[PDB]
Structure 1
Amino acid sequence: DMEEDILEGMRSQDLDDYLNGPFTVVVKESCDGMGDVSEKHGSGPAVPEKAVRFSFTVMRITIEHGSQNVKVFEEPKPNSELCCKPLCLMLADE
């Protein structure tokens, strides 16, 4: 999904636009709760219903050209909300 961003990454560091790997992809791992999600309109407090997700984040991407590593991608807003891709969702208590 981040195709053009990795190509513009190696253009901006002035490598070839065509290059085989290997790229090393440093990936952040995170799992934390989500508190409440109950949609009980009114009547009476139906129940709690705590849910929790499992997620990750493509933090940075490096490559080397023979001898030296070079950073072709760095994610600018790391602990954001737009870049925390969901992997698993469950309606289970933490």
Structure 2
Amino acid sequence: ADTISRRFRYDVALVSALKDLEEDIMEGLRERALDDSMCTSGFTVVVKESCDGMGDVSEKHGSGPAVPEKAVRFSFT
């Protein structure tokens, strides 16, 4: 169990990004003139994702291997 990784509770990452784009969704409800006490439920967000890795990344002060080479960054938008 040496493989080092970091990530998020996916759902929480979502609720973050959504609470961000809150401003835009509200202004967009304002342009479309759609009511608010009636647009509380029927929402649908489409999620894109992607995953690739970078080869053998270069770094400084690593004359020996500190596994500072490979990285695969899984993401969404």
Normalised by the size of structure 2, how large is the TM-score? 0.56
Q: Give how far 1:13 is off.
A: 1.2
Structure 1: which amino acid aligns with 2:71? A
More helix by share: 2
Take 1:17 and 1:34, find their aligned partners in 2: how far apart are those partners? 45
Which ranges of structure 1 fall in alignment gaps of 5 or more residues? 58-94
1:13 equivalent in structure 2: 32
More strand by share: 1
The structure with higher relative contact order (CA 8 Å, sep 6+) is 1
Take 2:33 and 2:54, find their aligned partners in 1: how far apart are those partners? 43
Give the aligned length.
Answer: 55
Take 2:26 and 2:46, find their aligned partners in 1: how far apart are those partners? 17
Which ranges of structure 2 fall in alignment gaps of 5 or more residues? 1-19
Structure 2: which amino acid aligns with 1:49? E
CA deviations on 1:36-88 (whole Å, 9 max, x unpaired) are: 4342337x4x346110111001xxxxxxxxxxxxxxxxxxxxxxxxxxxxxxx
- CA 20–37 in structure 1, closer or farther in 2 if over 3 Å, else same: same
1:37 equivalent in structure 2: 57
Take 1:34 and 1:23, find their aligned partners in 2: how far apart are those partners? 36
Normalised by the size of structure 1, how large is the TM-score? 0.47
Q: Give the ranges of 4+ consecutive aligned residues of structure 1 lying more than 6 Å apart after TM superposition.
A: none
Q: Note the 1:38-77 alignment, pairs <5 A.
A: 38-41=58-61, 44=63, 46-47=64-65, 49-57=69-77
